[PDB]
Structures are given as structure tokens and as C-alpha cells.
Amino acid sequence: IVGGQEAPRSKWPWQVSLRVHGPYWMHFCGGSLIHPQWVLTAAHCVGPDVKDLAALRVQLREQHLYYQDQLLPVSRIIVHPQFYTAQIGADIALLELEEPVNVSSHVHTVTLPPASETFPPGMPCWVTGWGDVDNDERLPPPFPLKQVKVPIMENHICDAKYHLGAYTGDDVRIVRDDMLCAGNTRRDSCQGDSGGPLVCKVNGTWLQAGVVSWGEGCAQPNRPGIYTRVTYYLDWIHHYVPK
Amino acid sequence: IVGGQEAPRSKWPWQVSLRVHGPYWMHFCGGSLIHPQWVLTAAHCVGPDVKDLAALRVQLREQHLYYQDQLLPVSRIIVHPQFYTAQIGADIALLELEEPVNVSSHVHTVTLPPASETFPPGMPCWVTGWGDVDNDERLPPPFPLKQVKVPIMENHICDAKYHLGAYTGDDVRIVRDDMLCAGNTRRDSCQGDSGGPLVCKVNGTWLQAGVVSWGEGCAQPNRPGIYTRVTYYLDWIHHYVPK
Amino acid sequence: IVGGQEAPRSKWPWQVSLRVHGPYWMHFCGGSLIHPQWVLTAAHCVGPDVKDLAALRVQLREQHLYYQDQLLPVSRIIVHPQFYTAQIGADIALLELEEPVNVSSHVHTVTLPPASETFPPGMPCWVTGWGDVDNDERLPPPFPLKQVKVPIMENHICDAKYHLGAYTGDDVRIVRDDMLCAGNTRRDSCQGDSGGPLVCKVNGTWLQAGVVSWGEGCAQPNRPGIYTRVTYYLDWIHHYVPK
Amino acid sequence: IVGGQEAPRSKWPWQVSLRVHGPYWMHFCGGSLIHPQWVLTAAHCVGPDVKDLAALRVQLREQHLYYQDQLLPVSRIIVHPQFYTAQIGADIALLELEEPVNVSSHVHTVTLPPASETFPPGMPCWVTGWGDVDNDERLPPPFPLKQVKVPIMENHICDAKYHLGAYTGDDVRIVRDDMLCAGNTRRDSCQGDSGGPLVCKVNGTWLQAGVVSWGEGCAQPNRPGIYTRVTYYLDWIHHYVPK
Amino acid sequence: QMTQSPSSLSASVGDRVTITCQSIKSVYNNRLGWYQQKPGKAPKLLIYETSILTSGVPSRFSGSGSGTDFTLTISSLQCEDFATYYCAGGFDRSGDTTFGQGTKVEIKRTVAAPSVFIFPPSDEQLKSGTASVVCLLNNFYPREAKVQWKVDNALQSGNSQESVTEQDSKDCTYSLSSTLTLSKADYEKHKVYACEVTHQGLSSPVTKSFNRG
Amino acid sequence: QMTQSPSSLSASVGDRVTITCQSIKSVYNNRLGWYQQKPGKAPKLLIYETSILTSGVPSRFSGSGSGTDFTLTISSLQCEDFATYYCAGGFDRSGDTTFGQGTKVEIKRTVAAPSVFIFPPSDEQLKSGTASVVCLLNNFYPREAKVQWKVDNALQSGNSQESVTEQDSKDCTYSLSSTLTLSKADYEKHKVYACEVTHQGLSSPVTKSFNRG
Amino acid sequence: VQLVESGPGCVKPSETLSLTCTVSRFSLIGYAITWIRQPPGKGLEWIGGISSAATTFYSSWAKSRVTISVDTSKNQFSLKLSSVTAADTAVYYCARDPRGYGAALDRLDLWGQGTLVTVSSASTKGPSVFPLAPALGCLVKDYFCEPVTVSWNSGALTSGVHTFPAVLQSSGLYSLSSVVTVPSSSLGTQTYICNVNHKPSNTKVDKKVEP
Amino acid sequence: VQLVESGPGCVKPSETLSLTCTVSRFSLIGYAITWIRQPPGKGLEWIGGISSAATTFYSSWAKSRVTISVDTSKNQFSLKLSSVTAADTAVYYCARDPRGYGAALDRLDLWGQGTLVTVSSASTKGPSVFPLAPALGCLVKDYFCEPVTVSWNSGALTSGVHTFPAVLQSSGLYSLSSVVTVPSSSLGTQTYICNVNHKPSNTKVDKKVEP
Secondary structure, eight states, X not given: OBXXXXXXXXXXXXXXXXXXXXXXXXXXXXXXXXXXXXXEEOGGGTOSXXXXXXXXXXXXXXXXXXXXXXXBXXXXXXXXXXXXXXXXXOOOEEEEESSOOOOBTTBOOOBOOOTTOOOOTTOOEEEEESOOSXXXXXXXXXXXXXXXXXXXXXXXXXXXXXXXXXXXXXXXXXXXXXXXXXXXXXXXXXXXXXTOEEEEEETTEEEEEEEXXXXXXXXXXXXXXXXXXXXXXXXXXXXXXXX | OBSOEEOOTTSOTTEEEEEEOSSSOEEXXXXXXXXXXXXXXXXXXXXXXXXXXXXXXXXXXXXXXXXXXXXXXXXXXXXXXXXXOTTTSOXXXXXXESSOOOOBTTBOOOBOOOTTOOOOTTOOEEEEESOOSBTTBOOOTTOBOEEEEEOEEOHHHHHHHHHTTBOSOTTSOOSOTTEEEEOBTTBBOOTTOTTOEEEEEETTEEEEEEEEEEOSSSSOTTOOEXXXXXXXXXXXXXXXXXX | OBSOEEOOTTSOTTEEEEEEOSSSOEEEEEEEEEETTEEEEOGGGTXXXXXXXXXXXXXXXXXXXXXXXXXXXXXXXXXXXXXXXXXTSOOOEXXXXXXXXXXXXXXXXXXXXXXXXXXXXXXXEXXXXXXXXXXXXOOOTTOBOEEEEEOEEOHHHHHHHHHTTBOSOTTSOXXXXXXXXXXXXXXXXXXXXXXXXXXXXXXXXXXXXXXXXXXXXXXXXXXXXXXXXXXXXXXXXXXXXXX | OBSOEEOOTTSOTTEEEEEEOSSSOEEEEEEEEEETTEEEEOGGGTOSBOOOGGGEEEEOOXXXXXXXXXXXXXXXXXXXXTXXXXXXXXXXXXXXXXXXXXXXXXXXXXXXXXXXXXXXXXXXXXXXXSOOSBXXXXXOTTOBOEEEEEOXXXXXXXXXXXXXXXXXXXXXXXXXXXXXXXXXXXXXXXXXXXXXXXXXXXXXXXXXXXXXXXXXXXXXXXXXXXXXXXXXXXXXXXXXXXX | OEEEEOSEEEEETTOOOEEEEEESSOOTTSOEEEEEXXXXXXXXXXXXXXXXXXXXXXXXXXXXXXXXXXXXXESSOOSTXXXXXXXXXXXXXXXXXXXXXXXXXXXXXXXXXXXXXXXXXXXXXXXXXXXXEEEEEEEEBSSOEEEEEEETTEEEOSSEEEEEOSOOTTXXXXXXXXXXXXXXXXXXXXXXXXXXXXXXXXXXXXXXXXXXX | OEEEEOSEEEEETTOOOEEEEEESSOOTTSXXXXXXXXXXXXXXXXXXXXXXXXXXXXXXXXXXXXXXXXXXXXXXXXXXXXXXXEEEEESSSSSOEEEOOOEEEEEEOOOBOOEEEEEOOOHHHHTTTEEEEEEEEEEEXXXXXXXXXXXXXXXXXXXXXXXXXXXXXXTOOEEEEEEEEEEHHHXXXXXXXXXXXXXXXXXXOEEXXXXXX | OOEEEEOOSEEOTTSOEEEEEEESSSOOTTOXXXXXXXXXXXXXXXXXXXXXXXXEEEOXXXXXXXXXXXXXGGTEEEEEEOSOOGGGOEEEEEEEETTXXXXXXXXXXXXXXXXXXXXXXXXXXXOEEEEXXXXXXXXXXXXXXXXXXXXXXXXXXXXSOEEOOOEEOTTSOEEEEEEEOOOGXXXXXXXXXXXXXXXXXXXXXXXXXXX | OOXXXXXXXXXXXXXXXXXXXXXXXXXXTTOEEEEEEEOTTSOOEEEEXXXXXXXXXXXXXXXGTEEEEEEGGGTEEEEEEOSOOGGGOXXXXXXXXXXXXXXXXXXXXXXXXXXEEEEOSSOOBOOEEEEEOOOEEEEEEEEBSSOOEEEEGGGTOOSSOEEOOOEEOTTSOEEEEEEEOOOGGGTTTSOOEEXXXXXXXXXXXXXXXXX
């Protein structure tokens, strides 16, 4: 997270950390709890090549990484069939937990938006995670969960932004209809925030607008962060997640 | 280059090295001399964001890097308008030299194929460059030009191989019609060979079939190297290069 | 610490961590609380060149580094006048805290040995710290305080071992009378444990025998760890520390 | 070498490079040819622990490393019995070549000084090598032999300078009588120059005054480079080298 | 709950064998594996997730299955492939998971004549008034052997017990230890002691003997 | 120039042996080594610089020496330690360096009865008017065996040749192939063919036979 | 990297059995453990296990009587079974699932050695031992509550050793015989020391074989 | 990482013999090679070698007739011996010294396989081959200029194969027999293909064994 504070303890109960085996169960990607047994995350964290489930664990909302690890196992991974790279699109994936989670005041699911929501510019949206804090800098070793409030851009304005200073012809669409844009030179997600939720407070309710996907570096001029547009994939999600 | 020998001095006169400014004019990408004033190379070496020509130089066919550097300046860069990432396609670019080159027995242009050539499997094709020699290993500090002979695969067979061991749906085309496949677990290009030529000896004449583009690592099982298919772009090339 | 467990919470109340300013107050060396206002540590952690006290802080006994930091400031540093490098000798130093420490059941001073104690082989001695865990491996990110029980070697037997496999003449003393030897190829201090205490339980009382000083790598054959012999410097210590 | 030029081809015929096995025969230390079968170098390049002669080769005076390698084998290594670390002293060693070298106008031995020579300040002295060029910077990949002219400093003045800004007591000798000092903040040897010769042109003849030994970083204020004083060890050298 | 078949089999070296496992339902998510238990030691995982070969296992072993019925197959038998085999699988999460009853694989091989030995009772038995005489057969095949004890030519019955090494880990043959139990008050009664094996792979009875002093 | 001793030896499994090498001068700088040559393959370095054990060599082997006289010693013999051994050393640089004459190590072991077989002449010999009958002994010990050929009970002499496998790499016994050379014009003369071994580890002569049709 | 069980070997009826498994390397933070039982001659049965999330699962019959637990302060897993009966005599194993599932049997990759538990009314007793005169061997007799272990020259004599299955004497005590085949030229030439121990009475004793 | 020799196998008297060794991996830049000779039944003799510095050393007799050379463009070392005589028939080896000494024999760590060279007046000839009716085997006969190589099922049948030393028939041609012992239940049950080649006539031929 570029910019922003440490998060208040109560504030983001659906945030998940994904761990990979090694000398220790290292954090590598974020996610969100959308149902007591399902986690929503970015496909490029787990694909396109298949992974052994021996190597993966899920951690719920701790405040500081690694201090209180109670690693949950994963029963299955599902990746959108259209995925191959993040710039092509369909960067979305599902994890099914072996054991369901006791929902609690401290651990609660995020709400998915109705398919009619567009999230026009000006909305109040936040992104959260344990990713890097400046363009090359690891989060320092207390490892707090950070948060930042980002601006939203309309897609066609975002596509124009990406064409500045590039050789790509202006006929060629860079930012696609299954994507969403947010952030600016002061406020962005970064490495290791991938797969984390972007949420917006619509009508008093927190809805997940998107998933941290890709960008041309962190906080760079005329390069907003690109997010997977969750409403675009609702029919694919509800084929598996028991609504 | 994974596998293969050091190259004989006479053998590959069109090979070019691209240098970037730094503590020294470091090699970063390959190319080929196709006309006394034009170099053909991969777009992802120079784009999609625009580069200052102050920071770029070209070196013709030395045998060992850095020992004889007579760095030529570059007047213009042209990148295919459709390019944005190597997996999407159109990974091709042109450099126009400030000063034309004296063609000589030791410095000669490669011949571009006629648009009807397909390069079917079984042809004798080679790739050359100063790239890495194993999956993480730099070329050791004498820095010789290496070469290897690779096998050719038919595209639809190559696309099938890329689906093995991946989540990607079998309907989704990974290897596209503007691309070409070559190599195997014993013989491949690697990093820093990008942009180099792949040539095949057809009817006694060396023709450039492709440009080193991308792959899922070097010499990995069921992951052949992917090359830009030169015949696909002839009309774009001959808009600038005086045939 | 090579070998050994995580430490029980109650067990080592005098252990200190030294922090250096940076992107965060990083741990770099250990020490021990010997009086409510004085810390004993290795000279090579702070010298021989002079340090700005702006860049230094002391952390008292926590269980896991960084999770509960309450950084104490340092008023003065005193290094033994004879010190220049660890192999020459006199690798010992004192820190005077700005503010005295409330001694507590959880924070208590170690006892210094009487000058007559020799610590003969066979004694039960331990060393503790947050240093590296194998020859090149950082302690993983929960950062627990570790402990190991080491054997003691008689000096002249230790000096003999250091001559095996070396060009050094057998007349040349390597291990000096102000030093002490401990450990074996399974049990040793390592990098970042420097300056930490070695303690032995003599007549029911824990006494500090030495300070972690130097060695030819960690847990290597015929290379025990070398420790500064605390009894050798009592007169120098009690010139400053109010007995 | 900090400061100074590339060396003229004819100028330093006794310069030697020592190579260690690896992915290639990498340069790690310098030396000088003092007799058709003997090389003089620093002990800390080869000791104090014993080395397998399988892993070592000698290269005579080339202009650029690696481009013309003709690696000579080594029959024996001799290290001064008093050596254990460079700051203690006796940092000197001998290599005996398997095969003697054809002395040539391009490969010639340096002359050792008579024991009465002191090398007072103001003499014209040079040091040469393929070591690093700034405090952390490798020599760039054409790898030329560099040279610099340093100032000589009287020992007791040098010893005083090493006390500025240090905790070490002024009674404690840092720079010893078997050592010699040279250089300044603009002109010094550095990493990988170790073991190389320091030569002075006395009465028209080049004599080797010293061997590159140690220092507190490269070109640092009030930290001249320290060299082993060759005249101090003549009787040890002529026990083996046939005068 | 599962059944596994066959409950037993016998096959020569160089043969090929297959084993089946069955169920009333299907395996929740390719969760079926095969274990090899050598005699006297912990079971080893061989195949997991229906068909992934465990690393370091020689690719002699194979298996696949249709969710309800599963198969395990050897390339060709060796002697050290001798083991019991079990399928195991899981039909849900947290609930119904079980092993099968197991299949024991035994090897046909060429007959081998028993090597016969005998050893006297030693000091501390007699120094405690006890005794025991051991007679030994090595590397014989098949298990069909019969050993009589005869003492002063008088045939003995009961008063003896036998034990068998289950299999030779490389020869795939058996050793047999036989012991005549005795006291000193009996042991002093008779002077000559002999054991005599009849076994199908022999020309004849063959007797080996000693005598007390 | 060097001498090595003994020129040969024989020793049982579990024994210990030592070999010496000598010289008129001394070795320039610990430059002496020992090589193991298995039959039919390249020599292997075992010890170098008088006493450094080559990596991966089991530390059964040892050696040391006083510059002029050197020794090589086994912990205890196995069957696959069977080899010829050579010392090699160098007395200067560029000049006098040589191997020794070598020592061949052979193993004492228990007698073994020859397993005897015979095979008829096959098609293409007879279809070319040639023939050859092979008789075979396996895993016998010692090399002392004698094979007669008898045809129609008539004893045959000459007209036969033998060859021997030098040693069994694990059993340390010998196999022997014997061939009766023949033409078709001779082969049609006689109907019954037999070979019969006498060997020291047998009860008796044992005959194995066939007949032409 | 390995598990080790621990247990009493012998217990009487109506005590509670306790067992303990310890992670010999690293910490199995993230991993799971299951307990497996094998009655003599029967196949394997599953007792229960604990997941990486610390959820415990129990087999059908085990819920009435079993408790499984974990203690990171000792790097240990523990099983307790109440109200034992003679039918509980079996080998017990601990094994690891690398996915961390608390209730799965298809991928138990790493196993302990297992320990016998014998449920019986009897007492412990130590063995007697004797040499066997020279082939040659070593003999162990009249012990109770197996296993017994036999080793020659502290195990340096790894080679050729046969060891036979114990049988009950009608006296209610087990006996076993250990044997090697060697050529007679080896007699005296090799040291042939016999070493024996019997954990259920902490006993260790040694004797040499020689004519 | 290995050396390979190459050579003609057969040469007549008074030609010059040529041999060649090739570095199968990396480049032996920095290393040295020596040539070793072994006449039948005799011990080893040293021909010569070349140091890491490219200095050549020759044995006492070899200086009259030998040349050793190196060519980095082919990653090869080469030996030439002039004016050969019948007494030059031997196995020839190339071997590496890791210290790079041109004239040392105490530390030859890595060896080629070696190749026979036979000095003789005769011609080459290819072998004939036959099956042996079933134990079972394969037979090769009447070849000249050994070696001959025999392999079953392209070598997949690694197991149990005996192969006997060749003997001269009085006709001046060598013969050899290859044999395996197997239980008769294996007949037909295993494919038992025989494959044969004879490099000194580039010949390769195959045949099956079956009753």
C-alpha cells in the first residue's frame, strides 16, 4: 500500500492472507472471505499453471502478520477458464476452505455488489493489504495491515491515460471492460497487495468493487492501478458459491 | 542460449547487440541487420513506453562482447502500433541507424522470407545470442556468441502443449497465428537473447523465420520458446524499409 | 543460534537487544543488563570508530522481536581502550542508559562471576539470542528468542583445534587468555548473536561467564565459538559500574 | 583501484592475476612475479586455512582479464608461519609455479629492495590491479588493468591518523613495524587489488616496496591503505627463493 | 466403506498383477491412495490422488480409477516388492474415510534345499538347571517342511516349538528355528541328540546330530 | 621407478590385507596415489596425496607412507573389492613418474557345485552347414573343473574350446562356456550328445545330455 | 525429518493409555497428525486426528473415549484413550498429512515407527540371555511385554543377522532367537559381540559369542 | 562430465595411428590430459600429456614418435603415434588431472572409457549371429577386430546377462557367447530380444530368442 495508515483493529473483517510453504509460511497474496467457505482472489496468484495444495494455507484477519498464525487448509482451487495473463483479462479465482469458518464480530464476509452497480467516479473506496509500501520497499517487520482511500476513474479516461508516453496506437484498447481503474501518484496498491479487495461504501453498506490485479509500477504518473471488475463475473462466481 | 556451442567467427554476420547506458554500455537485447540502415528486433525490448535515444547504441557482429566496442548511434525507433505485451502479439520493432553500414564479408544483411514460406516442421533452424546459458546463469565473462540448432513445432501442436498442466480452458488460444514455436528441454533461447534472429537454411539460402519473443521459462518441459512470425508482418516492415 | 529451542517466557530476564536506525529500528547485536543502568556487550558491535548516539536504542527482554517495542535511549558508550579487532582481544563494551530500569520479576540483572571462578569443562552453560539459525539463514519472521546449551573447552585444547587444517605455526597463540571457548558442530552462536551473554549455573546461581565474540563461521568442524572471558575484565568493569 | 588510468601495455610486466575455480576461472587476488618460478602475494588471499591446489591457477600479465587466458598451474603454497589475520601482521605468501616462465620483453620479474631501503615520504610509487573502482563498484566488463600513483606516509604519522575518530587508546599501536602506509581520499587500492605490488622508482630502477594488505574501507578520510613492508621479510623470502 | 480384492494372491517374479478396491459411493475429489507395508515397519505412501507417483518410487507401480472402482498395477514383480497393500480413501470432508482390508502379495519361486544346523545347550541354562537345543533351517522353499526330534534314536513329540522368518527380503525364502525345551535333570539322561528334516525340496531325509560330550 | 608387492595375493572375505610400493628415491611432494581397476573398465582413483580418501569412496581403504615406502590397506574385504591395484607416483616435475606393476587381489570362498546346461545347434548354422553345441557351468568354485565331451558315448578330444567369466561381481564365482565345434556333415553322423563335468565341489561326475531329435 | 511415538508398552486394563508424538525437526506449524492403530494380523484402523487449524476429528467408535491434543511448547502431539480393554492391544502410529487436513487418509506422507501397546493383567519382567555356541548366534529368553531388541557390536555388525519372531512359552513368557550364517574361517577373526535391551523394563545387557 | 576416446580400432602396421578425446561438458580450459596405454595382461604405461599451460611432456620412448595437441575450436585433445608395430596393440585412455599438471600420475581423477587398438595385417570382417535355444542366450560368431558389443532389448534387459570372453578360432576369427539364467516360467513371458553391433565394420543387427 502506497500512502495510507495502519488499519484500526475492528475495521476490515473479511481480509485474508495467502501463505506459501518455505523456511516459513510466507505471505504472498491477499484475498477476501465472501462466504463462510470461499475466498475470492486474483488468478495470477495461483495460476495459470496448477499448484499443489500441500504448499498453500489461508490466514484470516490478524492485525500483524506472523504473530498469531492459525493456518487454515484449502480443499480446492478454481480459476476462471479464460485466464492466462493479467493484461488479457479474467484475472479472478476462488479458494474453497476445507473447514468452514465461524463467523464472528471479528471475522465476517464482505458483500458482493448487485450486477447493476457501476461505481461511478467520486465514490468512497478503500484498498487494504500487506504489500510493499514504496516502489521497491518491503513492509517493515512489525507487518501491520495498511489501508488507503483511492479515487475512481471512468474506464475510457483510464485508457487514454495509459496511451500517454507509449508507442501503442490509440485504436488498441489497453483497459478492458472487465477491468476497473483507481488510484493516483499518491495512493495505490503495490506488490504483494495483489488479489486484495477494493471496497466501496454504497448506501451505508460495504460492497467489494474489485480485485487488485496489475499496473505499470506503483504510483507512477499516468498509470493508475487496474482492478478486476467483480460485477463482470457474478454469474461465474455464483456457479460455485452457494448464494 | 541453452545448449549449443560457441559460434565460428565467419558464421552469423547479421547478428547485432543492443546496448543501454549505465556504468558501461551494457548489452540487454539482440537484433538483426536486415538492410544497411535498419535493425529488426523485438518490441518488448524498447516498448511500449517511449525511450530516449540518448540511452541506446547498436553494436555489430563482434565475437566477444565489450572487447571491440564501436557503438553506432540510432536515429529513430518504430514499434508496431498493435504492441502492448508479448503474449498478446505484434512483438516486433525497427531501428533506423543514423549512419549506414559498410557491408563487408564479415558484416552482411539477413534475407527476409517470401510471404508464402511456412517453415514446416523438420527444417534446419538456428538461434544465436549472448543471453543466459541456464535458467538463472549469466554468460561467463569471456562473453562469446553462442548458437544452437532447434526443432520446429506446428502451431496447433504447440498450443496443445501449453495447455498441459495449466488451468486455462482448451478453447482459449495461447499461441497465436502471428507466432511460431521452436526448441525443447535441451535447446532453447533464454533471457538476453530476446529480439535475436531465428534463421532457417531454405534452398541453400539463410532466411530469418522469427524473432525471439517469450516463453514460460527456459527449456522447461512442455514449454517451447515462442517466436514472432516474420512473414506475418512483411507489409508492415516494407512500409519503412526500402525494398 | 545453531541448534536449540525457543526460550520459555520466564527464563532469561537479563537479555537485551540493540537496535540501529534505518527504515525501522533493526536489531543488530545482543547484550545483558548487569546493573539497573548498565548494559554489557561486545566492543565490535559499536567500535572501534565512534558512533552517534542518535542512531542507537536498547530493547529489554521481549519474547518476539519488534512486536512490543519500547525503545530506551542510551546516554554514553564506553569501549575498552585496548580494543581494535576481535581476534586481538579486549572485545568488551559498556552502555549507560539514560533512565534507570524498574527491576521486576520479568526484568532482572545477571550476576557477574567472582574473579576466582574458572568455569572448568563440564559445566552447564547456555547462550541465547536472536541471531542467524544456520550458516547463512536469517531467523524467520515470528523472531523468537532462542537458546542452546553448549559444552565448554579448556583454552589450550581449543587453541590446538584452531591449528588443525591451517598454515599457522604451532607456536603462534590463536586463542588468548582473555578468551573462552564453547560449542561444537551441532551447537553454537552465530551472526547477530554477537555481544550476547553466555551463562553458567554455578551453585544454583546463574553467572555470566562470557560475551559472544568471534569464530571461523558457525558450527564448523574444529572451530568452536570464541567468547570474551568476563573475569578477565572485572577491574575495568567496576571502574564504571557502581558495585 | 580508486582513481588513476588504464595502464599502458608495456608498463607493468610483473603483474599477476590469481584465479579460483567456479563457473569460470574468476579473478580474486593479485600478485607479482619475483623469480621465473615464484609469485609473491598476500597471505590472506590463500590462508590461514589450507587450500586445495586443484582450485587455483595463475595468469601472467594480460591487458584485459579473461580475453586471453593461458592459466599456469601452481605446485606449492607457502604462507608465513606467523600469519593469522591481516591486522596482526605477517600478511605475506609465496606461490611456486609448476613450470618456469620464459622471461620476455613482455614478462619480466620485479626487483626486491635491499634491506637498507626505507622508502621515505615523497617517493614516486604506484599500485596496479584489477580490483574495484569505487567503494562498492566492480570494474566494468572490458576489465582493463588500472594504475595509480600514491603518496607515501611515515608510519608514526599513519598510526596517529588511524586514532582520529576511534575509541582505541593512543598507547595501542595500530600500524606496526612490518607495515607501510600510502594513499589518500583520492587515490587508493581497493577490494580485489589485495596482494598486488606497490612499486617505487628508486635510482631509475623499479623496486617493490610492499604488498596490498588491508584498510578501513577504500579512500576513506584519515584511513590510508596499509601495505606489508617487503624489506621486513627478506630473510624469510630468501629461504625459499633462489637468489 | 470399501472392499479390496483379491484378499490374497501368489505370482512369480517377472509376472504382472493388479489389485482392485471398490465402494458404495465415490471419492470426494480424487482422494484415493495406495500404501506399501513392508513386514515389521510403517506403511509407505506409494500413489496419491488416484495416480500421482510418490517421488523416489520406481515407476514400476501404476494406478487409475473411475471414482467408484480403482486399480493398482505393477510393471513386473521383484522380490522386495513383497508387502501387504492397502487402499485408502475419503468420501467427504470430516467424515467417512477408511482403509481397505488389505491384500498380501506372495512370490512363487524355485525350490531350495534347507541348510540344516544344530547347537548345544550352553552354560547358564545348565548352570541354572535349564536347557535348550536349537536346530535351524535356512533359505528353504516352500514352507512345507517337517522336522522330527529323535533323542537316543527315541522319537520325541511335543516338547518343541517353531518360529519362521516371514520372508527373505532378497532371496524370498524362509528360515526356521526349532527348539527342544529341556531341564538339566532331563538333559543328563541322554547323550546323543539329533534333528532330521523332511522337506519337499530334498533328495531324502537328511540328519544332523551331535552328542552330549 | 618402483616396485610393488605382493605381485599377487589371496584372502578371504572379512580378512585384512596390505600392499606395499617402493622406490629408489622419494616422492617429490606427497605425490603418490592408488588406483582400483575393476575388470573390463577404466581405473578409478582411490587415494591421493599419500592419504586423502577420494570422495564417495567407502572409508574401508587406507594408506600412508614414509616418502620411500608406502602402504595400502583394507578395512575388511568384500566381494566387489575384487580388482587389480596400482600405485603411481612422481619423483620430480616434468620427468620421472610411473605406475607400479600392479597387484591382483583374489578372494577365497566356499566351494559351489556347477550348474550344468547344454543347448543344441540352431538353424542358420545348419542352414549354412556349420554347427556348434554349447555346454555351460555356472557359479562354480574353484576354477578346478574338467569337462569331457562324449558323443554316442565315444569320447571326444580336441575339437573344443573354453572361456571363463573372470569373476562374479557379487558372488565371486565363475561361469564356463564350452563349445563343441562341428559341421553339418559331421553333425548328421551322430544322434546322442552329452557333456559331463568333473569338479572338486561335486559328489560325483554328473552328466547332462540330449540327442539329435 | 521424522516422528517418534512414546508410550508405556505395557498397561493393565482400566487405566487410561497415553501416547505422545514429537516433531524431530522444524515445527509442524501448518501441518496435521492422525493416529492409526493396527491389531495383530488385522489391517489398519483410523483413530482420529487434528487439522492444521486445530480442529479434531474422531472415528465412529473413538468419540466415546479419545482425546487428541497439541502443545507447541513441547513440539508434541498427544493421544489419550480411556478405559482400555485387552482388545486394544495394537501397534499405534502417528502420521502427517502435508495438506493439513484433519480427516484424510489418502496422503499420509510421513510416519512414525510405531509402538506396541499390550493390554494385560501381568507384570513386566526382564529377559535372561545366553550365547549360542558356533554359523553362530545369540539368544534371548523369558522376557515379557514385547518388543525386545537385539543388536550385535552396538549394531556395527549390521550384516547377515536373522532374527526370529517370538513365541509364547506355555509359562506365559516370550522367547526369541537371533542367528547369523558365516563361514567358519570368520570365527575369532570377527568380534561378534551381542547387545540386548528391553525398554519395558529399561534393561540393557551385553554378552560376547565365542566357542 | 566425461571424456570419450575415438579411434579406428583396427590399423595395419606402418600407418600412423590417430586418437581423439572430447570434453563432453564445459570446456577443460584450465585442465590437463594424459594418455595411458595398457597392453593385454600387462599393467599401465604412460605415453605423455599436455599441461594447462599447453606444455607437452613425453615418456622416455614416446618422444621419438608421439605428438599431442589441443584444439579449442573442437573441444578436443588428439594423440598421433607414428610407424606403428604389432606390439602397439593396447587399450588407450585419456584422463584428466584437476591440478593441470602436464606430467603427473598421482591424481588422475576422471577417465575416458578407453578404446582398443589392434595392429594387424588382416582385414576387418563383420560377425554372424544366431539364437541359442532355451536358461537361454544369444550367440555372436566369426567377427574380427574386437570389441563386439551385445545388448538385449536395446539394453532394457539389463538383468542377469553373462557375457563370455572371446577366443580365437584357429580360423583367425573371434567368437563369443552371451547367456542368461532365468526360470523356465519366464519363457515367452518376457520379450528377450537380442541386439548386436560391431563398430569396426559399423555393423548393427538384431534377432529374437524364442523356442
